Symmetry: C3
Subunit: 420 residues, 3 copies
């Protein structure tokens, strides 16, 4: 319970209401990002710059493969000793880890049969001559292959190649290769250092492809308009499963999760306004959002979640405990609520809820428009309630509002309430 009838007399008013959703089971797709382009159409003019680029790429990829091969051996070393049907992590060889790292280490082994199927297509992956392409694995699964720089050459150099000289072509292509290297290090740098525990969103991945994430979703067989709820929440993420150093490519597995609606769970918003005490202006201190689950009250940090037109969407169940004074305050003992003095006009003075208006008519102008007379609260009353029994249209500050009727047994009274 939140006992709104006692909260209103201390400036706390009932806002909007939402349901709670959290991430469900996954679905996955395969993508290959090529770092060495198929320059074969202009090959004779640019050989010197190309040979220099390949060595730098290979030096950059060599450390990553040893991190992957190391983690694969800790699981294989277990599976070969014991009869059990599941994968077994060798704890003595690993030595120190959180439960999350052990879980991601077993998932890396579980993904290895796709990586082996990709490795059988190496010569077909090398020979692509388009900016994006689709191929079929022996698993019957499809693979998407991305090749940005061959797109740049097809657009910018080939239509004018009769005007340019051989030295101009070589010098022109050389600067484009170093720009692409700078983009790769900016997008993938953190994942190349810690490949087992790091995930990247599809929006960030697309920065290597001019930011065109709409083409990426399209070639995987989706539509960006249908995926809106998980795309806008940034829940579509990928991770590295394998690296090929001699060919120069990265293989990624990309995940499209379901959403689960939590039963008996509600999120409630609270609106604060100022109020009058014996001639001074004060404000109450409370969190903006509160979570209720099967009568239990709790805090929730919505900065780690996305708010939509009707739902709050989180990656995990971010509920947090609540202190005894705040629980006492929200359950109707207003003497336990904390308060602060007002020194700026930026704090609001009125609000609308269920068609009724609550206002602090000692610090803002309130007038009745039908009879054209001012409205005054006593120096004993903290807040004033505006409904259609007195008159049908009110001026509040510099706005005109029409109001509904009060669902109660008599006149609203706010004289001399308990507070602390």
């Amino acid at each position: 319970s939140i006992h709104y009838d006692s909260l209103s007399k201390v400036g706390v008013i009932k806002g909007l209401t939402y349901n709670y959703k959290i991430k469900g089971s996954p679905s996955t797709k395969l993508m290959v990002v090529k770092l060495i382009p198929n320059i074969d159409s202009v090959k004779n003019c640019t050989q010197k710059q190309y040979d220099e680029y390949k060595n730098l790429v290979r030096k950059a990829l060599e450390p990553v493969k040893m991190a992957i091969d190391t983690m694969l051996n800790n699981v294989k070393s277990g599976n070969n000793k014991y009869r059990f049907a599941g994968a077994i992590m060798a704890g003595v060889a690993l030595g120190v880890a959180t439960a999350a790292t052990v879980t991601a280490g077993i998932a890396l082994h579980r993904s290895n049969e796709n990586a082996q199927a990709i490795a059988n297509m190496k010569s077909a992956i090398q020979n692509t001559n388009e900016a994006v392409k689709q191929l079929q694995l022996a698993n019957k699964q499809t693979l998407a292959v991305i090749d940005t720089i061959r797109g740049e050459i097809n657009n910018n150099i080939i239509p004018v190649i009769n005007q340019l000289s051989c030295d101009t072509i070589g010098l022109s292509v050389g600067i484009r290769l170093t720009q692409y290297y700078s983009e790769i290090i900016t997008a993938f740098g953190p994942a190349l250092q810690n490949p087992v525990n790091t995930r990247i969103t599809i929006q960030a991945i697309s920065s290597v492809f001019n930011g065109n994430f709409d083409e990426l979703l399209k070639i995987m067989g989706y539509t960006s308009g249908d995926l809106y709820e998980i795309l806008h929440s940034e829940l579509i993420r990928g991770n590295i499963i394998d690296v090929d150093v001699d060919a120069g490519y990265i293989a990624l597995e990309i995940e499209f999760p379901n959403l689960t609606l939590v039963p008996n769970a509600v999120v409630q918003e609270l609106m604060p306004i100022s109020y009058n005490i014996d001639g001074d202006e004060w404000v109450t201190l409370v969190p903006r959002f509160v979570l209720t689950r099967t009568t239990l009250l709790s805090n929730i940090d919505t900065s780690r979640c996305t708010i939509t037109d009707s739902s709050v969407i989180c990656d995990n169940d971010y509920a947090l405990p609540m202190s005894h004074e705040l629980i006492g305050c929200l359950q109707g003992d207003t003497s336990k609520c904390a308060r602060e003095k007002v020194v700026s006009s930026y704090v609001p003075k009125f609000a609308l809820s269920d068609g009724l208006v609550y206002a602090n008519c000692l610090n803002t102008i309130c007038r009745c428009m039908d009879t054209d007379t001012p409205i005054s609260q006593s120096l004993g009353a903290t807040v004033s309630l505006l409904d259609n029994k007195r008159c049908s249209v009110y001026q509040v500050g510099d706005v005109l509002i029409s109001v509904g009727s009060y669902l109660g047994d008599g006149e609203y009274n706010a004289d001399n309430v308990e507070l602390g």
Copy 2:
């Protein structure tokens, strides 16, 4: 009062001084952003990809117009019942809202006559064939029309169109349309969801126009060098007033505010240094900036404001209350000031103010350069003052400084001050 003479003996020294400015009355201009380009120069080669693009745009715009039409009906439903000269909000139909939402809902109705004037120019808006254009409304007001992709076709495809094949042109244009769609969703996505309460800065708006905000200000009749104080503060912002689904465009109103100088208001900076107590090194805890208005002291969170060479500029009056211990400390009762022990050399040891130097000569080397002898403070004194009565140039740490004269009645004394 801040009683700097007592604060100096506890390491708190007087810094720079600024005046306070807050946002004033507005001025506005009109802009139209087109989502469906005028492809008419290459039309025969790209019809298949164009027809697919238009349906996706229309599906994306259909939800936004219903949010706008819904809010317009809540005001019209009031205006038709009553004689009053101002606009009236229907509170029963709206049900729940903050004062800010009611205010933005009335402003949306007030802007509707410009939207109707724009809607009379629809055929002239469709026929533009340039990246940016100016038109005249029947209000005598001007309108700026933006068309990015027709600029791309004029630059990249038309000069080489004799070299490319029909299939190459179609495939080439198709990827540019999906890239533009990805850019729109990234820039406008939050505003398309909540069009009544959301505002966008001109810098962010320009990301749909290659980031060239200088052209946008130029066609509206301004110069980016004159607008520096409001542009650098990020106070130039726009909001959506209407949407046309069949033609595929968004109409925006853009605001250029005035700045108001608050009378009798001053912002004062404070500089902390370490100090000596009985052989140990300590530091005092105080906020960096303090606000004084007509003798009243208050806190101010300058992270929400911009600091210039002479003024602090804020969007609203962000003043906040101050606790009784901090007020006691700043008004000269140093026994109420809070302190901390020092465990790193990154904390500073000296500072310059009004041509005089204050230093902790037990934790840094202080020497007189004229006589070439060291300077020592007793174990009873917290801080030392360096002025030109003793000698004219000092070495402090690894820097040489020349100093002024002390405006006082005698020798400065820092023995055994009151502290807690």
Copy 3:
């Protein structure tokens, strides 16, 4: 000491270990950024737009040179009066400053002989016709000169110049100049306002050169693969030393620092898990990282540092003091540790350290796989220890793990420990 044997019984477990590194002595290089391009190849077609651009650039540069000339006079006014071999700051003319500002003001004078050598090359700097170039000063030092827009004209306009008309060329170049002006104001705007105290990273500087920082490091004679540890930490930074208003260029000095390994300093990570008290689930509150230097314990805010595979790298020594209750807790008086109640399943239940597993087997399923039987802790015990004396493979939650042997004198006991 951290007395891990008492901490384990309250859910705090030993994580990874790192060494501490801080920034050392500098090394520097010279760079010139040109704001007025060498349009001389298309000059006849674009004169009107070019003359308009130059006046706006000069108006933008005029305020910056007076800030530089003002600070240079405060040092020169000292050096001319006194015999001392070092530079002398005039404190009366400066009036108010922090020790950091005095230090940067003397450094600006120390850099002035390079600025004079650059100023002798003005006609050679103006005549460059390439996107990037190298020149030699009379100091025998090299200078790197950047010219982005001449690169754009060499790539985009000259190969098609027989197809375009004179008016098309002029209009086309004019929009590229205003886009470049918008990019300059976005990258350098804060430094142009406060040129003495502001530094910019090489990644941010490169945004004026299509983001290609790899070319910048290459022409300065480095390789981005060797500089990884300081580049990834973002310690490579530059600052403005001079401005030329009539020619329209900015001169920068760029710094490549060394790293110093602090002796006898270690950073230790801590892993928290939940635990059982009399039937309820609880958690302990402690910082993630702790710093030890020659037996002294301290806090460290690693959000201002970079964490690698083995080292923590900071710009300055960010150590901070620690409270008496936390020191008491970590030195084995667990009655002083603070705790919280658990209301979400997102909190972890087990962890691996030194080949042994610690788990809360009342809130997760624990079973022995060799004998296929469940494991249970009493209602008196907070935590359970899993080692190879009982059986060699365990199921914990939904994962299978193989474990090592306990280095102790007998059975581990967690009954009825002291807590508060």
